[PDB]
Amino acid sequence: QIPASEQETLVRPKPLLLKLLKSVGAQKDTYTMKEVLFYLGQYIMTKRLYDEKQQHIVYCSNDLLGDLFGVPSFSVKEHRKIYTMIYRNLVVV
């Protein structure tokens, strides 16, 4: 679980994360973390990266998301790990 105050942190995605956020129909350059996570979820859906067998795993190898996160897959239940992977791809305002 992520504290409410941290979800409202203002952030500026680096070029690659920004690129994939905009393909999902985020238009802007500055976000709250809550917004980044929403649009990442929408990206995963669009690209069908979530496990079809519903085992709470995203298979991101060989996709831009895998490149950014530096992992072939990850658990959607591990929110702090996800936040950390995202933070490495942005600058806090």
Ligand SMILES: CC(C)(C)NC(=O)C(c1c(C(=O)O)[nH]c2cc(Cl)ccc12)N(C=O)Cc1ccc(F)c(F)c1
């Ligand atoms: C498309 C699918 C993979 C089924 N989405 C989700 O599982 C997903 C979610 C959301 C969401 O619900 O907005 N955003 C995500 C971003 C990433 Cl990188 C991974 C998962 C999510 N979640 C829903 O509860 C998990 C989640 C929510 C908020 C978080 F901060 C988080 F790290 C994971």
